[PDB]
Amino acid sequence: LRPLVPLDGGRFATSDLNDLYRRVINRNNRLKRLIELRAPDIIIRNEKRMLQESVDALFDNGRRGRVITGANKRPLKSLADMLKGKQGRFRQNLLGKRVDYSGRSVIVVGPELKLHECGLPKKMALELFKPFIYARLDAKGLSGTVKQSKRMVEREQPQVWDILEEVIREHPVLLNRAPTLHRLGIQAFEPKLIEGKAIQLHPLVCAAFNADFDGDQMAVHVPLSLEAQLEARVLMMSTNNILSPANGRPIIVPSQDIVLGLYYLSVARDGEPGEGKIFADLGEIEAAMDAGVVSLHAKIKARHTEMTPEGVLLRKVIDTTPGRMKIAALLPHHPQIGHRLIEKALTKKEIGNLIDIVYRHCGQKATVIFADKVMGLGFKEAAKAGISFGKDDIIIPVRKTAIVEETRKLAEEYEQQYITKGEKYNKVVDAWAKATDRVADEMMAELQMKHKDENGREKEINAIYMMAHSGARGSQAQMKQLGGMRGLMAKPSGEIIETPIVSNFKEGLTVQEYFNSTHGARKGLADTALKTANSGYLTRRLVD
Amino acid sequence: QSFTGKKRIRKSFGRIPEAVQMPNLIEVQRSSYEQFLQRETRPGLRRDEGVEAVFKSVFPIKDFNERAVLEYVSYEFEEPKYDVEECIQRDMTFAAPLKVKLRLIVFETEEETGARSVKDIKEQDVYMGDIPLMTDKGTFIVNGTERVIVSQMHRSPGVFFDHDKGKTHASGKLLFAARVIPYRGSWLDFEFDAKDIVYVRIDRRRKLPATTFLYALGMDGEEILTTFYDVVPFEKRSGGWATPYKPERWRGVKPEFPLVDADTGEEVAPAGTKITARQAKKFADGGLKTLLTGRYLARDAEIYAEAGDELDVTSIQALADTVGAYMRNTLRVDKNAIREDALFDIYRVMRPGEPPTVEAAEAMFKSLFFDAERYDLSSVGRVKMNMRLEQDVSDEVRILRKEDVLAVLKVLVGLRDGRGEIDDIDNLGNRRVRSVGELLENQYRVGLLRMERAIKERMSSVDIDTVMPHDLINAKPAAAAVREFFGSSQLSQFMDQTNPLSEITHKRRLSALGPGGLTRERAGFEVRDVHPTHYGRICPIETPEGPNIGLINSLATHARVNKYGFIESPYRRVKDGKPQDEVVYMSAMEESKHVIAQSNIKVAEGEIVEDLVPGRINGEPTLLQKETVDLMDVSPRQVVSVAAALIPFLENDDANRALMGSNMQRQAVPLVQSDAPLVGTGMEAVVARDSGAVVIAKRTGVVEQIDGTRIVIRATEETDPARSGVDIYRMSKFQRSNQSTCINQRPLVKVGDRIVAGDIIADGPSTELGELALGRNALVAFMPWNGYNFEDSILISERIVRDDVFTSIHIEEFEVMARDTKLGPEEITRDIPNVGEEALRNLDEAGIVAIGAEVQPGDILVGKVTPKGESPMTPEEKLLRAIFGEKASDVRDTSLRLPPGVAGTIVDVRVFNRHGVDKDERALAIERAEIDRLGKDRDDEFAILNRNISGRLKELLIGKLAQVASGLWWQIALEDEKAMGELESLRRLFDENRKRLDRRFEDKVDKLQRGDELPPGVMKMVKVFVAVKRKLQPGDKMAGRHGNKGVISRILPIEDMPFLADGTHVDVVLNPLGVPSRMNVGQIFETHLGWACANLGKQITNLLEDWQQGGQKQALVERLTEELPDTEEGLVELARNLGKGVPIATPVFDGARMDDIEGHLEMAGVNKSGQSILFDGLTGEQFKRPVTVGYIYMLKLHHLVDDKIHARSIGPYSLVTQQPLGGKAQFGGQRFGEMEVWALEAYGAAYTLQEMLTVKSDDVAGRTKVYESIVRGDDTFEAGIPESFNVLVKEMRSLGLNVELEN
Amino acid sequence: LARGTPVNIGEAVGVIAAQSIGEPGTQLT
Amino acid sequence: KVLKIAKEPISLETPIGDEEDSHLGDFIEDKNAILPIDAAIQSNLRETTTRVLASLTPREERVLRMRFGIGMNTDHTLEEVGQQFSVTRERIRQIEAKALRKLKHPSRSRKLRSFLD
Amino acid sequence: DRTDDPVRMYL
Amino acid sequence: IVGRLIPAGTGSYLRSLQRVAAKRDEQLAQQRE
Ligand SMILES: [Mg+2]
């Protein structure tokens, strides 16, 4: 347990307990020699006290004066110090076992993969499925012995890759993200031997993982047992983790890209080519779109089966749109669902309610297949849409300079005579804290209006407004911070800044306003790194 | 413009910043060590701060038992025994020996005589040790992988008054803990409590009363309240109410007594404000009032008075013949009324176990505070105290004076209720920054104190008369202190050398953690914030995102460290209206009284014409008028740091997202062919020129030749006769950086191009044309392409991997040892038995891989043959050996192998043989090739030196048919003697230079042949330097320049990428969703500016291809770029560099606004909308929306997929727990933690948890069983007791517990 | 909360609830 | 040999990074813990030997196994395994040599050619 | 006056 | 920590099966006295 293994360099690495036990043995030998020597009564009792202190430090070492090792200056750990910290039964020994048969690789988006299939690098699948590869080679007869198999996979022969794709067919692997905050952090996936050296993770499932693809090492595990390999298929599969355990809301809802694509497909405008041009089937819409007769602004009529009543429903000619029909065809056929759900703008909240209603009324198989289809559909209709952010995307409100001037003038009328705290609060709350949502509200109103071109057809909707309304990445606060008034920054004690901060990120912020911004934002950034520790402690207390 | 911008002219966008040139970026640590190591003659050694002061304060000692003094005259600094270029390879300490003068005298003799027979000093000298002299680039090479010492920000010495914020209060009251933090000693706390009493909580151990502390100083009792109270003008019993009192403090107090005037009357019963009564008393020749009882009478008052002030009477015995109430309360609560009692209490508080004595307690307090040996408060502490609480001149004194504690108590009791603001403990000026200089000075002072203790213990035995010089002075703790400081210190823990910006940002890094400051946990949410005084001195954006946020914030670009330690940021001083040019680095302490107005203000030709200039008078920004302004910001980038100053449009980025981008600027690997960003920042040139790994022209002469490995330069246009001659810059080739990355330099200067002194000649790692280039500019389309960039992931084109544009080297340089084990000496021969011949390829006779031979992952790198004992004879293995006829190899395979990777080729294989037997039978050809190349480079240097010497001699002789007589270089062959004598002197000086070079080279070859420095155990060490060519494989954390990070997506071919209007395909396709979520819209503006620059470059290169150096091309360049017109013929070369996009130097806060970018797009043939039509690549269709297609400056961040990927079914297990090791060090496994095991616990996957943490990792008897079962075919396992539970029960059984299983 | 079906015997209800309560962390305050 | 005598054994609980996490004790390898792969070759070497010995003579296979020990760990010498079968003489050594030269062909010693490494 | 130290107690 | 099967989930179902198997074994033992 306390080893003395010879480290590289001839310097032995003795455990902390070895020095404590050596000290205890020295104290015991000294006491035995003193008692047999008939030492003075004040030295034998003092020897007993030293032995008692040594035995105390050997067990806990905290209640005593923290006896340090003779060589190093760090406080020596003991039988109690090990169990207390993470390096004992708490984290290192029992709970947080460094399990083998695992792998950590940077993750990349896997939109070509199914929802129940995660990308696995070929260079990692061999080191992960070494015993499984050996078993497949032995049963198939390719390798005579285990040593010959290890000699085969060690060089990565071309004949072992065919066996790796065969062994990894229905063997789910546990995808373990670095930080886990719920049971969906460990989701088993049917691995796919993808090229490269990065775990091709599904886009819909990474939201549940809390793993974006800005750099997030997803530790992959491989269940060895036949039950664990099957336990990861019945419970740990990504298809079974659609609804998050927090509430009755599906966690497989599109976060950023698929939601934006569905919003672009569902946005309907009265002005567009092919107005009221009735279509026969779903394929007619795409056939006409490829011919340039009907646009994707969702303003054309066609046929679609809604399936509202009991049993099959007739193909009623609905007055719906073509864009909402591409998503409507992906919806499973079942009562209480259909095109009635896609009639809305199909934002992130609406799309989550749609994945919830499809799971609440229909089964999990149809729900997961609809999530897989809509991700591919949203991806194909988002890249073809051209949602790139631009300078004119974030439109500054033209009615902003006048309101800023009037606010700063109102901040000076009462400041002439002056209580200073009351005047300040009138100039920071009613002057800047107020009318900062007025400028943001005016910006949102000028951004919501669909500009109509000279040909009677609207040019396009702002990409930033689309992202804010659909719920992919935008928000009212973020919109105001980017193009609005930017609000007022915070203070170290929590007070709001009184100086005027009138500039958005689209415009050039001077040194003082940006310094206030980085003074108010570093507090939240530390909270993301400091309050998260309290979150981890609370989670540890709750699970225990 | 100095041979670095002439070919890369950057159209600046700043309004008019020329206030003050930014100082050297590495100048912080440079100027720090240059006050710690003077390294000059005797008159230059006069330094009250540095190693000299601490040495002279600790070196002179005395002997109270023998009268032996050890005087210090001065120390002489010697040159380093090893050069930096030679110490980086040897992996030794780049240190210089310290020689100090000693003088032992025995003049003080007995018999009342002051001179003895050996009274004269001996003038001794002792080898102090070797200290790591700071490299010119500030690296502090202690061993291989040079580590630079990051500056520390500890609490500056001085008194502090931290007013409590209600916490630890009775109900809601404040504490006002007056604490003086010494530079080196014990802390003092004068905090209050709910009882309204000051308690001297020394070092937060006990809470004894402050009356004991005052008694310890001597000024306590009847003289402590002299500065707190005074006598009252009261009288005795007489007719009516007679009293000679003057009314001066009765205002704002109810008239409890009828203190009316004598004749008429005054002091009416209302007693509202006493505004008229005070004036009447002052104008009536005093406020004679004819009138308390239960007041404080603790004033000065032994025949008629007594100790204490508690009467409760009506002035019996003839009276013994609401702002301040703190001193009177403490004197009564104190149970000690004698100084001896206070000393005993202090001794019991400090040392409770030891029995306090009368003189022992008094000596303890004196040694703690009254002793300068222990309570060594630095001069910065004394000056900070003098500024906080006003006192006399005390720069010389260090210990807290007895009068200083009185002033501290007075200011504390005054600030308890208003009367001045408290001293914030979280102020930049309050938090003095310490650097490697002061840290090494303190640790060397500790080592010198230890050496002084050792010398005092040793001198009592060895007599001073007829003693060998420096025989008692030790040298182990002297060098041991610096070794620990550079070996395992928290400040010297690592040097981020991924690129020139990482070195600068790591050198300019003020870490608040480490020894002497708060740890990572100790920080809390207070110090992890940014104070208002941080403005201009410490960047608020560039900070690590991990747990150490707000603690390792890097210094500002313009901020400097004063001699005291406080950060001094420059401020352009301005007079009334007219802003003058005089600048002064105003420290954060003195910045509060001065009003500061920010830069970027519209100033007229002679003054500011705004009249409403913004700024902050003290931290809080306000709107100060044109007048009443004395300090102005030097530049807008003064608030940002070096790593943050290179963020273009940084004012547009979010305060939080800019922290992500500023952290990855220093985390970008050096890319081959990396060019400067088209939309970069002017700070890039300064950060690249003021950084390491870039050779700067130290002379003015013209370069002679350039061969990559070196670059020769002429002396100068006006050079001294024999000062230096020609200066050759040995260009650093591909050597492994501290981050296991490449460090390559390219000779940007061409053959025959004059270069002035002070400019960058050859670029460093990730640099082009002198400007810093963290990566390469790639055409970016901020659109979601088929969901491959759904999250923050970054789609990628094959052109950015096919053209070799985002590919680094990342030289691993693995190390192998050949230590002589106990079971016979270990060998490094060809190969270990039982190894195939395929793995033995690329190995020479010595056993190491051939230099330049590609090695696959896992191939044999160096065959290590380690003799051992007979392995455990197994029956099946013995039967197999007897069947095959072979014999059991007594040696165990230990040859070093490459870990799983794409390393491949080997750059360098250095072998360090033992001094005893080196090159006997191994590494002979390696050392032979080394000496051959050394002689070759020496001959080349000698040849170039002789060439330039002959050229100079011919130039000197032509002025004083020479072609027919070429051998007259050493002889005039005429009657001339003066010219011949001067030529002979110059030639002899040059021959002396050549002889010095030959002597250095022969010393190097002798050191190589004698045996390199090896550890005591290993005899032969091979340092194989394997280099990788990592492409842009899917998984590389390719983060943007602003903070928009993201793993690279699937590498799409150059056919499926989105097509542009001109037919070009974008190299990367980012996600536009990152801008609205994280407000980094400057990335969009930066991309628009990059697109404008790229279109300008395509227009200029399309204009030069038809007509090279055309008359109209200069007009277009002038319209786009004025320092552009250059008389030289470099216009044909400037366009060649501008064809990839005209670079731009946009300031951090004074760059191009929206209108500037709009005008640039209009003038560069770009659409006015900023976006551009982008045809699809996968299917192919004109997108029905304007797509942003620009040239974003992407990076190749060190968090790759190769260095981060990992997969280990079963690797080496631990010893204490028998678990698989962690991390990618040796086949580690992903630790399955308590919070990650709860994911399966809440799940129904209990069989996994019964096999993942039971049989997978911690079952030595079950792991092999489950592996054999998986290999056989059956997926069945069994594991009852894991090794974790076994070690846990064994540890619990180690104590008095009875942990024991049952049934 | 995993699916619409009722809770089945054997689920770590307490662990699931603890994880659901800890998930809102890192973005509170 | 005086120098390099393990002057000071470093504490196995010393920190490894900038913080006090992941001490050196958690990174030290194990040179005695039998890896699961090396146990796999042990089990298969027990299977691959029982198969090669199944082709030999029953009594000859028994005496050859007694010479080394597949089930019984008591490795007997030539004479000790000789007494168990017949008169302890060179006949046992002769049959052992014959068996050893027997399973050296490409047919019998096929899966073992890549086993000795 | 609890020292909680063997050295101090011995002294 | 002990390493045995968890009493929750699949481990819970296996514990229930072990309990019912122990009950069946007790019933069988009661048959043969
Ligand atoms: Mg992420």
Short mmCIF file of N, CA and C in Angstrom, two decimals, chain B residues 58-116:
data_model
loop_
_atom_site.label_atom_id
_atom_site.label_comp_id
_atom_site.label_asym_id
_atom_site.label_seq_id
_atom_site.Cartn_x
_atom_site.Cartn_y
_atom_site.Cartn_z
N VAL B 58 23.11 40.49 5.59
CA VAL B 58 23.19 39.17 6.20
C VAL B 58 24.62 38.63 6.27
N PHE B 59 25.50 39.05 5.35
CA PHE B 59 26.85 38.49 5.34
C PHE B 59 27.67 38.92 6.54
N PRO B 60 27.78 40.21 6.88
CA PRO B 60 28.56 40.61 8.06
C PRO B 60 27.95 40.05 9.34
N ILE B 61 28.75 39.28 10.07
CA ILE B 61 28.33 38.64 11.31
C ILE B 61 29.41 38.86 12.37
N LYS B 62 29.06 38.56 13.61
CA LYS B 62 29.97 38.71 14.74
C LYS B 62 29.88 37.47 15.62
N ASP B 63 30.86 37.32 16.50
CA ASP B 63 30.92 36.21 17.45
C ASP B 63 31.01 36.78 18.86
N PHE B 64 29.97 36.55 19.65
CA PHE B 64 29.94 37.04 21.03
C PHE B 64 30.78 36.19 21.97
N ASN B 65 31.28 35.04 21.53
CA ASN B 65 32.10 34.18 22.36
C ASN B 65 33.58 34.23 22.01
N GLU B 66 33.93 34.66 20.80
CA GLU B 66 35.32 34.77 20.39
C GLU B 66 35.67 36.11 19.76
N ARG B 67 34.70 37.00 19.55
CA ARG B 67 34.94 38.30 18.93
C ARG B 67 35.51 38.13 17.52
N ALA B 68 34.73 37.47 16.67
CA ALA B 68 35.10 37.20 15.29
C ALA B 68 34.07 37.82 14.37
N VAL B 69 34.51 38.73 13.51
CA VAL B 69 33.64 39.40 12.55
C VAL B 69 33.97 38.90 11.15
N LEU B 70 32.95 38.85 10.31
CA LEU B 70 33.06 38.37 8.93
C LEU B 70 32.54 39.48 8.02
N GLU B 71 33.43 40.37 7.62
CA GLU B 71 33.03 41.57 6.90
C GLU B 71 32.80 41.28 5.42
N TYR B 72 32.02 42.16 4.78
CA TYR B 72 31.69 42.07 3.36
C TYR B 72 32.17 43.33 2.66
N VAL B 73 33.10 43.18 1.72
CA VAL B 73 33.61 44.31 0.95
C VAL B 73 32.75 44.51 -0.29
N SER B 74 32.75 43.53 -1.19
CA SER B 74 31.94 43.56 -2.40
C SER B 74 32.02 42.19 -3.07
N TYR B 75 31.09 41.95 -3.99
CA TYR B 75 31.05 40.72 -4.77
C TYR B 75 31.31 41.02 -6.24
N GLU B 76 32.06 40.13 -6.89
CA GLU B 76 32.40 40.26 -8.30
C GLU B 76 31.65 39.21 -9.10
N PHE B 77 30.93 39.66 -10.13
CA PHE B 77 30.14 38.77 -10.97
C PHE B 77 30.98 38.30 -12.15
N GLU B 78 31.01 36.99 -12.36
CA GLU B 78 31.77 36.38 -13.44
C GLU B 78 30.84 35.93 -14.56
N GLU B 79 31.40 35.81 -15.75
CA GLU B 79 30.62 35.39 -16.90
C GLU B 79 30.14 33.95 -16.72
N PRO B 80 29.04 33.58 -17.36
CA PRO B 80 28.52 32.21 -17.20
C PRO B 80 29.45 31.20 -17.86
N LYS B 81 29.64 30.07 -17.18
CA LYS B 81 30.49 29.01 -17.70
C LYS B 81 29.92 28.38 -18.96
N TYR B 82 28.60 28.44 -19.15
CA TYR B 82 27.95 27.87 -20.32
C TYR B 82 27.07 28.92 -20.97
N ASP B 83 27.05 28.92 -22.30
CA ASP B 83 26.22 29.86 -23.04
C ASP B 83 24.77 29.38 -23.08
N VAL B 84 23.87 30.31 -23.39
CA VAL B 84 22.45 29.97 -23.45
C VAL B 84 22.19 28.95 -24.55
N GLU B 85 22.77 29.17 -25.73
CA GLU B 85 22.61 28.22 -26.83
C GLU B 85 23.24 26.88 -26.50
N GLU B 86 24.29 26.87 -25.68
CA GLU B 86 24.92 25.63 -25.25
C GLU B 86 24.30 25.06 -23.99
N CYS B 87 23.64 25.89 -23.18
CA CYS B 87 22.98 25.40 -21.98
C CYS B 87 21.61 24.81 -22.27
N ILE B 88 20.95 25.27 -23.34
CA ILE B 88 19.66 24.70 -23.70
C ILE B 88 19.80 23.24 -24.10
N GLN B 89 20.93 22.87 -24.70
CA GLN B 89 21.14 21.49 -25.11
C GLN B 89 21.67 20.63 -23.97
N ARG B 90 22.57 21.18 -23.15
CA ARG B 90 23.12 20.43 -22.04
C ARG B 90 22.09 20.14 -20.96
N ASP B 91 21.00 20.90 -20.91
CA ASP B 91 19.96 20.72 -19.90
C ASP B 91 20.50 20.97 -18.50
N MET B 92 21.40 21.95 -18.38
CA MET B 92 22.02 22.31 -17.11
C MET B 92 21.58 23.71 -16.70
N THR B 93 22.16 24.19 -15.60
CA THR B 93 21.81 25.49 -15.05
C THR B 93 22.60 26.58 -15.76
N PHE B 94 21.91 27.44 -16.49
CA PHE B 94 22.54 28.61 -17.11
C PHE B 94 22.75 29.65 -16.01
N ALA B 95 23.83 29.45 -15.25
CA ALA B 95 24.12 30.28 -14.09
C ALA B 95 25.56 30.75 -14.13
N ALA B 96 25.81 31.88 -13.46
CA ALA B 96 27.14 32.44 -13.33
C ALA B 96 27.60 32.38 -11.88
N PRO B 97 28.86 32.02 -11.64
CA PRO B 97 29.34 31.93 -10.25
C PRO B 97 29.38 33.29 -9.58
N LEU B 98 29.17 33.28 -8.27
CA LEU B 98 29.18 34.49 -7.45
C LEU B 98 30.43 34.49 -6.58
N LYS B 99 31.28 35.49 -6.76
CA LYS B 99 32.50 35.65 -5.98
C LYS B 99 32.34 36.87 -5.08
N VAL B 100 32.39 36.66 -3.77
CA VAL B 100 32.22 37.72 -2.78
C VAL B 100 33.50 37.86 -1.98
N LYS B 101 33.83 39.10 -1.62
CA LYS B 101 35.03 39.37 -0.85
C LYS B 101 34.77 39.18 0.63
N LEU B 102 35.73 38.59 1.33
CA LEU B 102 35.64 38.33 2.76
C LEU B 102 36.78 39.04 3.48
N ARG B 103 36.52 39.41 4.74
CA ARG B 103 37.53 40.09 5.55
C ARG B 103 37.29 39.70 7.01
N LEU B 104 38.10 38.77 7.51
CA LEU B 104 38.04 38.35 8.91
C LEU B 104 39.14 39.04 9.69
N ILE B 105 38.76 39.69 10.79
CA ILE B 105 39.71 40.43 11.62
C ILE B 105 39.58 39.97 13.07
N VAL B 106 40.69 40.04 13.79
CA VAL B 106 40.73 39.67 15.20
C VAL B 106 41.32 40.84 15.99
N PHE B 107 41.10 42.06 15.49
CA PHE B 107 41.69 43.24 16.12
C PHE B 107 41.20 43.42 17.55
N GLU B 108 39.92 43.19 17.79
CA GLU B 108 39.35 43.36 19.13
C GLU B 108 39.87 42.25 20.03
N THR B 109 40.88 42.56 20.84
CA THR B 109 41.51 41.61 21.74
C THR B 109 41.12 41.92 23.18
N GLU B 110 41.69 41.16 24.10
CA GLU B 110 41.43 41.32 25.52
C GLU B 110 42.44 42.29 26.13
N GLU B 111 42.46 42.38 27.46
CA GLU B 111 43.38 43.25 28.19
C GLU B 111 43.14 44.72 27.87
N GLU B 112 41.90 45.07 27.52
CA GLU B 112 41.53 46.45 27.22
C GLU B 112 42.32 46.99 26.03
N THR B 113 42.53 46.15 25.02
CA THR B 113 43.25 46.51 23.81
C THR B 113 42.36 46.28 22.60
N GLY B 114 42.44 47.19 21.63
CA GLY B 114 41.65 47.13 20.43
C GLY B 114 42.37 46.63 19.19
N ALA B 115 43.61 46.15 19.33
CA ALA B 115 44.37 45.65 18.20
C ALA B 115 45.17 44.43 18.63
N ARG B 116 45.09 43.36 17.84
CA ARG B 116 45.81 42.13 18.10
C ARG B 116 46.86 41.90 17.01
#
